[PDB]
Design a protein around this ligand. Sequence first.
Ligand code: CEF
Length: 500
Amino acid sequence: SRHIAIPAHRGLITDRNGEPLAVSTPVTTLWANPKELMTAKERWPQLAAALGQDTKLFADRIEQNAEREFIYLVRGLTPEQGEGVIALKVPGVYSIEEFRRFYPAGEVVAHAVGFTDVDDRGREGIELAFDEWLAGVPGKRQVLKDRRGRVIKDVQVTKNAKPGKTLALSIDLRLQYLAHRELRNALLENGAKAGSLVIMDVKTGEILAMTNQPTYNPNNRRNLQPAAMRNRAMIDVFEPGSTVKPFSMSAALASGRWKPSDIVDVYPGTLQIGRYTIRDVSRNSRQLDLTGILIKSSNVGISKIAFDIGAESIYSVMQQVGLGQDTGLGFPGERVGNLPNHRKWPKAETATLAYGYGLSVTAIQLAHAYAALANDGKSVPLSMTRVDRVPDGVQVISPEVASTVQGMLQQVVEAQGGVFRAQVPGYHAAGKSGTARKNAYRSLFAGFAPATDPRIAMVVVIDEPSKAGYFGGLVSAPVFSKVMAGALRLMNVPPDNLPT
Ligand SMILES: *C(=O)[C@@H](NC(=O)/C(=N\OC)c1csc(N)n1)[C@@H]1N=C(C(=O)O)C(=C)CS1
């Protein structure tokens, strides 16, 4: 009276410049027909020894499967060892060439690229998200096999196997390597638990780099730490704190009620709402301008503006920029987080929202929001694939307001008492630091550069540094500076810190 398969070649994954990130490698699979093996039991020990398996257990397996016409012996071998096994001429042993992925960049892009399971199907990262694109379609062979199950003849092919298609990611391996190295070093210098760093192109929406620590070698899937396998930029939610204040400020400027030169009274550094007390870390301020509120990261100052303008305006900005919103990336394990909403906002939620307490975002969401702000208020859809034709953006923040806030974030980095460690020598940079209290802290910095014409947005999240420095401007700001400094030269962006 059979229907055997023709493996499809799994589609190549490259970075944006064509560097291979996931490559299908030929392997040899060996299967057997126990009906033939039963006629050649004397050959089994030599075959067993060559496969690794135990002599008596392997013999027990065949004796147990004597009546079956197909069984698997082994599925992953090099074609070097596959040819060595084939040369034994054992009756009933047949071979099939399959594919197993190899990841040339390994740990550098393990979380973004992801990996494949035993069936060459996508399980994590891009491999999973674009499995349909990458997998291709297996084919159906037909062969004449007699009563013994011996493949005697080849009668027909029922379906032709179609290879998967190539996919170019948005990731720039040069930028990915830099962010990976700098984030790892920063975690070691701070003795931190974990970290994430994302770089995005503000003009096209492309994710140029996305790294997390700890990472793993997807070529070493020796069943490592599941926790280490977490793509934190997409699956871990956190309260963004001060890094969300530029969006609260954007709502204030768009309200018509506030200008940067306006003053807010933040004395004595605390603000009471019933049983709840809002508190600033530095409580030696009285009058602060809107830029000063961001520089000093005054929670009181941002709260007073929020009460004046209303939480609805702030909620609308944070929602439209994507905080706690679906990214559209289609990553099955990716987290949306949560953006609290109310019909009538009470005072406590208005203040906490404006200073980012009780909100849940991802590092990718936080970065995308900063990308929209940097892109004069236009939100460009997120993309993990190279973008050749840029989709239309949505104007989420008015150009004037976004431009004004950009200037304010530049003063945060450049002005007296600002986050000078986030300065990117040679360029004008802008950003906002954050420190979230979980005696353990999370240190954040989000920003963009060059301020004169933003090109790149970046988010640096370091979880639980355990050394002396713990402020976002101390722990995460230097990482932004180091990575931003390298990324601008790697993209050949002209330095904008020039003389007047
Ligand atoms: C801004 O992020 C703000 N941080 C906080 O208010 C919090 N803890 O203070 C240490 C917080 C917000 S949500 C949560 N669970 N905890 C001020 N920002 C910074 C900064 O690093 O930018 C400071 C200079 C100190 S606190």
